[PDB]
Write a protein that binds this ligand. Structure first.
Ligand SMILES: CCOC(=O)Cc1nc(-c2ccc(S(=O)(=O)NCCC(C)C)cc2)cs1
Ligand SMILES: CCOC(=O)Cc1nc(-c2ccc(S(=O)(=O)NCCC(C)C)cc2)cs1
Lengths: 187, 187
């Protein structure tokens, strides 16, 4: 029933913005009354927050699975691909979740927390690559990590929403891997 | 008087969001009545659009001045620096203008037009660098241009707004030049 509210919201968000989805459409879709909805979620905005929180955590867990477990270009491609596949499978939640950063402090703070985590892990892997002699000591690892992660956030999300301008979705993984591998390994 | 409305809006936007600025605050600030304001601008949103349109065009003209007129790293640094200095001098208009992309089709379409222009010029310069034998034929120039331009938009604007996470403003030019020069010249 919680699940049916979440699935209904994900479905309707594929059609239209969260401003055009009412608690009645979410209730209707989950086969419950509007007061019954209020027992599971305080708002349609909390439904979006929860949807976003699962996509982010699904991306984070898939990155942890890689971390616990090739050539350097393929190492980076597999990591970036976790975010391409995870967000790319949940485009309506990606789009809605990004738009809510402007209006929800909880969505802004959720996004900020996982970006800080994914930057810190990028920096740790760049540092390990520098310690093993594979990557040169160029920029501060954490500053290079930050720019590469903000690049991916902006570029993946533009490609997914078909923005003008954007890298076509079928070219965006290759585009990002090239810039990551050349900026991490290049002198 | 048009100028005094524009200067007043730029000033108040340094303090608070456009939602917290009323046509009376703009009128008051420009020493005119509210009906007199309506003779210059249909809305406070049109005032933001015009402010954004001058900053974008000031950036574009400064890029044209370079184009009509060193080592490859310094060539790219001077180009990126046009955007760092121009937007960095107008942070409240940058911030407000970026936020209005969500709510104004005219702000979205203005931003899209100049991004397409600046990407096309980046691609043209990468192509000329490839034709002269200085840069290798790696990614499609226009796809590499797109990702590098979206990186800069996201990274410069995060640094300016002090977002978490962000590259510190005093490190962001060096960060972006490294990733540009290594991704453009690297194999
Ligand atoms: C073998 C173990 O090492 C690896 O797997 C390679 C690694 N990949 C990452 C990583 C890749 C992409 C992104 S990001 O920049 O794309 N996400 C934020 C942006 C949005 C998309 C959430 C963030 C972190 C860190 S280490
Ligand atoms: C000697 C002649 O050649 C040159 O000057 C070097 C050149 N620089 C550019 C250029 C630099 C940065 C950006 S961008 O990516 O920073 N702006 C969009 C994003 C936001 C910031 C507006 C866009 C284009 C093109 S060619």
């Amino acid at each position: 029933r919680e699940l049916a509210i979440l699935a209904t919201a994900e479905n309707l968000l594929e059609d239209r913005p969260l401003a055009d989805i009412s608690v009645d459409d979410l209730a209707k879709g989950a086969g419950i009354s509007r007061p019954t909805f209020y027992f599971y979620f305080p708002s349609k905005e909390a439904v979006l927050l929860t949807l976003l929180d699962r996509v982010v955590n699904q991306a984070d867990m898939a990155l942890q699975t890689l971390a616990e477990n090739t050539d350097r270009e393929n190492m980076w491609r597999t990591g970036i691909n976790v975010f391409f596949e995870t967000f790319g499978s949940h485009k309506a939640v990606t789009r809605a979740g990004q738009a809510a950063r402007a209006t929800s402090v909880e969505v802004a703070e959720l996004w900020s927390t996982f970006m800080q985590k994914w930057i810190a892990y990028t920096a740790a892997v760049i540092d390990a690559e520098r310690d093993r002699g594979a990557a040169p000591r160029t920029l501060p690892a954490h500053e290079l990590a930050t720019a590469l992660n903000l690049m991916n956030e902006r570029t993946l999300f533009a490609s997914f929403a078909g923005e003008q301008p954007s890298v076509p979705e079928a070219r965006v993984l290759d585009t990002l891997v090239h810039i990551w591998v050349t900026s991490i390994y290049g002198e």
